[PDB]
Structure 1
Amino acid sequence: KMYDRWFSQQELQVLPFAEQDEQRNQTWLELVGEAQQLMDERCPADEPRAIALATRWMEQLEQDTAGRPEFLTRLNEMHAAEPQMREQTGVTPEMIDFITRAFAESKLAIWARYLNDEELAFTRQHYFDRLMEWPALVADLHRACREKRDPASPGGQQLAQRWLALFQSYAGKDAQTQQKFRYAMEQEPHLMKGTWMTSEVLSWLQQAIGVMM
């Protein structure tokens, strides 16, 4: 019912959330209930149960948006504008904040092996500065790749510049530090979880980055 106000009926045919599926509903009942239980117990976001829960949240959310970042952004629009999303789904803004921070910890736990203490502390602080702007960029990268946009075109370079701004926001401006992050990406599959990125779109982006650099 709620999805009808936010997705076209064509989109509803491909949005798994809108499927009749008992297991999907049970899965989210568990994921929401377990998040609230950890929060009730004042579980820190860097506790292993929270990290594991948040990793599972992101896997499930990408599955149930059919890997479409524009469907993820649509859900976030919904959460802000639909009243009673707490009452309908159990998902609260405070719960998303918890999952967001726990998922960040899942990546900071890996970056710790690639960064020195100063770099890691910088990223722990600034990872959240512009985190919320990534889904919109990912959707635009998907569209550029789908439309066969030239990575060297002005608007392709606009996308590369946007990536750099968001990347430097969390990584800093030091070239040697940035090299560590890009090496970590190459070597750690988990660091591209919760991104809605595909190998095809990543390849397009890295071509656009190559032109820019």
Structure 2
Amino acid sequence: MYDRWFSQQELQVLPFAEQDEQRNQTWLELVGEAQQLMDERCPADEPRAIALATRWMEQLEQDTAGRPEFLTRLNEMHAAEPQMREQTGVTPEMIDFITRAFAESKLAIWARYLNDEELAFTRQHYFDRLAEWPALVADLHRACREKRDPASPGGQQLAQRWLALFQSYAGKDAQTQQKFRYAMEQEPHLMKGTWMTSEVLSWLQQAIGVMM
């Protein structure tokens, strides 16, 4: 199944391919527990749901080798592979539940940095363009590997896309955006589930610097 979507060279470095049992048992537990919460009508802002969603993103980043290009590949499979549902037990409805629960874990943090109106805006618009982040993070990793110049046209285009996705949920207000960047500096959890590394983040912030 994975062969239809990953090269055999990629399958060597893709933890999903190896037979480990602790890795399989870990996902049997995470999926079984997600379906149980959904059966119980558990809301996404429930501590159990939030805790599960965080563990879900931690494990998913580990088992993609921190490679966002593999994350984007799995999302291609969930949309295009009919076997994904039966093979993994992960449904599109389940992903929507985990996505909302993980977002709630960050909104719980942002509520300390934002006012009631700012938070209300972000809670509504956080999901507008959320699914486009993995494709951007993969291009950022690529630009970093290839030693692309942040000031080059291509590098500024990546900075522009980051700004587009960031303003989507933070808004255009300069003061409000400052709060987000300050929270990002103080809260390590806010950088979970991003596939971002200090090296890429450093490349991104040079590109944003030139854009200013």
TM-score interval for Structure 1 and Structure 2 normalised by the shorter chain? over 0.9
Task: Compute the displacement of 1:84 (Å).
Answer: 2.8
| Cα RMSD for the two superposed structures | 0.4
Question: May I ask how many residue pairs the two structures share in their alignment?
Answer: 212
Task: Compute the displacement of 1:20 (Å).
Answer: 1.2
TM-score by length of 2: 0.99
Distance 2:92 2:55 in 1: 18
Distance 1:148 1:104 in 2: 32
Distance 1:86 1:200 in 2: 35
Task: Compute the displacement of 1:86 (Å).
Answer: 1.5
Deviations 1:109-154 (A, max 9, x none): 0000000000000000000000000000000000001100000000
Alignment match, 2:160: 161
Distance 2:86 2:199 in 1: 38
Question: 5 Å matches for 1:1-213?
Answer: 2-213=1-212
Secondary structure of 1:18 counterpart: coil
Please say which of residues 47-56 and 84-93 is displaced more in the overlay.
Answer: 84-93
Distance 1:28 1:20 in 2: 13
Deviations 1:172-212 (A, max 9, x none): 00000000000000000000000000000000000000000
Task: Give 5+ residue unaligned stretches, structure 2.
Answer: none
Task: Give 5+ residue unaligned stretches, structure 1.
Answer: none
Distance 1:177 1:45 in 2: 26
Please say which of residues 84-93 and 47-56 is displaced more in the overlay.
Answer: 84-93
Identity %: 100
Deviations 1:13-72 (A, max 9, x none): 000000111100000000000000000000000000000000000000000000000000
Task: Compute the displacement of 1:85 (Å).
Answer: 1.6
Task: Compute the displacement of 1:107 (Å).
Answer: 0.2
Distance 2:18 2:189 in 1: 28
Distance 2:136 2:44 in 1: 26
Distance 1:86 1:151 in 2: 40
Secondary structure of 2:66 counterpart: coil
TM-score by length of 1: 0.99
